[PDB]
């Protein structure tokens, strides 16, 4: 009946928003990550780190605002407010990119908080912790992309910036520099995300179209009771439908729902792995055998060589403005260009 | 193209010619597919989380369900009571019919929109163009992330089908 | 000395065989191009 | 095409070893029943 147990009592009270011990970590950090993003996108520029406007105050819209990465010259500095770079000056902190580390790091501890919360509530309520397990995939993606990837590179500057259009630029950077679409770890991720959405749609559609008539209304939603024992749709008819339509069907409700966990979670883990490789520029960029042939044989052409020409265009036309700290100066005559364009 | 690298070629050139990423119907497509994967994992994990103990630790839990049994195999009230507490109560479904309809409708509608995106960029109604939308008091252009996207788009444009254009505008 | 009490049978049903072979064949199909390079 | 000569055996073992593992386990499951 000591203080630790009294606090435990209070943190775990059943209230509108459950708190828990995990709440101590989660709620400050989530709110601060989210406040940092909203604050930066409304008020803070990227002029000195990127040579970019990036807030509503400067004239940007919701698609173009961003909290942008620190300047390349910061290396991987934690950029603490009190550190040697900002030296406690809040304004300079904002201008050097300190809000990016702020959001990234509070965001990471919030994501931990959130998964501990899924563990905490699962234990109190008495259920198996698979929702927590599944959330490991979002965490793997976040840390590999926002933390591991820029740590292998020269600086945080090459991490994603927290913005809609900024993330689009990150997509295109990865195409032109890393040829990431060619990476089989991205391809497994594509399959898991697209396979997940498929499974989501096809499982919902099936349940809704093998419903049992359990009421008399044309709205079939009313005819369900959450404490009823009986299944609300026919697994037998669903199995026959799909067997006859597609050749094979699920027959085991448990396998079905495990597979729905398995497919998208695994795909996200796979894509995280390939990004770890790209942290080191360990790309699936080329096929050697294709290049040897093409170098010797100028009539040889595939969609593979066509895409590298596109990559080479991306790199040369975007690098000067996207990597301003490098002072790239490409005279017009060196820019790769096809005929006329 | 009916090929893996051919697909990527199609999607890089589509971005140069239509700025599909800045198009809201492709953004709804991403939200349809991201959300669908999210809710697939959520739903799979919540049902798996609330399976009723029917087996020992030496057997797959999947043998706790027999094809064609009448009783549900998980406890939706325990799953609702976990997820309602993870967020808050009224953000969680306890009607299984509403729930699976939501699962059906979210990705289907997202993918409707992204298909309509391609179908309407077919007639050259393209993604938002904020190229040089921010300029300063003198009139200097102040680049944004959209202008950086545009530099990438230009390099795809100028390089694609490098022998095929004789005139200065790629009008189709 | 008694025989070991902790031994257990292992199983792989036919559906798991089909699923695993498909997984392996598709992985091979995907990665083989990178092994030939 | 000038491809990595070991690509073949990598691919063969990559297919054969894990498939053989599953077949072994399947057949001895059937013989229990």
């Amino acid at each position: 009946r000591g203080w630790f147990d009294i606090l435990d009592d209070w943190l775990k009270r059943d209230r509108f928003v459950f708190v828990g011990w995990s709440g101590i970590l989660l709620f400050p950090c989530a709110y601060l990550a989210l406040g940092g993003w909203l604050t930066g996108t409304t008020f803070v520029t990227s002029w000195y780190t990127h040579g970019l406007a990036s807030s509503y105050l400067e004239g940007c819209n919701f698609l173009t605002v961003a909290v942008s990465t620190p300047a390349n010259s910061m290396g991987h500095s934690l950029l603490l407010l009190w550190g040697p770079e900002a030296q406690g000056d809040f304004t300079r902190w904002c201008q050097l990119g300190g809000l990016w580390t702020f959001i990234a790091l509070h965001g990471a501890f919030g994501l931990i908080g959130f998964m501990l919360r899924q563990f905490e509530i699962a234990r109190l309520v008495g259920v198996r912790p698979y929702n927590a397990i599944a959330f490991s995939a979002p965490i793997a993606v976040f840390v590999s992309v926002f933390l591991i990837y820029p740590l292998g590179q020269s600086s945080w500057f090459f991490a994603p910036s927290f913005g809609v259009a900024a993330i689009f630029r990150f997509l295109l950077f990865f195409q032109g520099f890393h040829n990431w679409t060619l990476n089989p770890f991205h391809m497994m991720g594509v399959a898991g995300v697209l396979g997940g959405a498929l499974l989501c749609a096809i499982h919902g559609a099936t349940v809704e179209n093998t419903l049992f008539q359990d009421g008399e209304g044309a709205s079939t939603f009313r005819a369900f009771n959450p404490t009823q024992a009986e299944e609300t749709y026919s697994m037998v008819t669903a199995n026959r439908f799909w067997s006859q339509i597609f050749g094979i069907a699920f027959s085991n409700k448990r396998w079905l729902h495990f597979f729905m966990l398995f497919v998208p979670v695994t795909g996200l883990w796979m894509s995280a792995i390939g990004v770890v490789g790209l942290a080191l520029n360990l790309r699936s960029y080329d096929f050697i055998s294709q290049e040897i042939r093409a170098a010797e044989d100028p009539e040889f052409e595939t969609f593979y060589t066509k895409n590298l020409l596109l990559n080479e265009g991306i790199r040369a036309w975007m690098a000067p403005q996207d990597q301003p700290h490098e002072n790239f100066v490409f005279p017009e005559e060196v820019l790769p260009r096809g005929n006329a364009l | 193209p009916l090929g893996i690298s051919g697909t990527f070629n199609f999607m890089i050139v589509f971005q140069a010619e239509h700025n599909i990423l800045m198009h809201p119907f492709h953004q709804l497509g991403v939200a349809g597919v991201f959300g669908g994967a999210l809710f697939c994992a959520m739903h799979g994990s919540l049902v798996t989380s609330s399976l009723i103990r029917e087996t020992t630790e030496t057997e797959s839990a999947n043998y706790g369900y027999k094809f064609g049994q009448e009783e549900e195999t998980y406890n939706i009230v325990a799953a609702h009571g976990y997820f309602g507490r993870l967020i808050f109560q009224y953000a969680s479904f306890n009607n299984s019919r509403s729930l699976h309809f939501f699962l059906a409708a979210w990705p289907v509608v997202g993918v409707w929109f992204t298909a309509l995106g391609i179908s309407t960029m077919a007639f050259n109604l393209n993604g938002f163009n904020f190229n040089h939308s921010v300029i300063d008091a003198k009139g200097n252009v102040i680049n944004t992330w959209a202008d950086i996207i545009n530099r990438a788009n230009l390099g795809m444009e100028v390089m694609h089908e490098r022998n095929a254009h004789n005139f200065p505008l790629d009008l189709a | 000395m008694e025989p070991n009490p902790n031994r257990q049978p292992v199983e792989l049903n036919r559906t798991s065989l089909y699923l695993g072979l498909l997984l392996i064949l598709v992985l091979a199909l995907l990665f083989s191009s990178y092994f030939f390079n | 095409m000038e491809v990595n000569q070991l690509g073949l055996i990598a691919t063969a073992l990559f297919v054969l070893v894990p498939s053989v593992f599953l077949i072994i386990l399947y057949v001895q499951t059937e013989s229990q029943q």
Binding site: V236, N239, S243, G247, I248, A249, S251 | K66, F67, G68, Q69 | N13, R14, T15, Y18, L21, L22, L25, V26, A28, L29, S32, S33, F36 | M1, V3, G7, L8, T11, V15
Partner: peptide
């Protein structure tokens, strides 16, 4: 050799499809 390998794997996948469909464990009720 690489062509033969690619086609061989694809052919095995098609054969697997045939057995997965026509020689599945039959779902039996209750």
């Amino acid at each position: 050799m690489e062509t033969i390998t690619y086609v061989f794997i694809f052919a095995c996948i098609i054969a697997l499809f045939f057995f997965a469909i026509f020689f599945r464990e039959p779902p039996r009720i209750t």
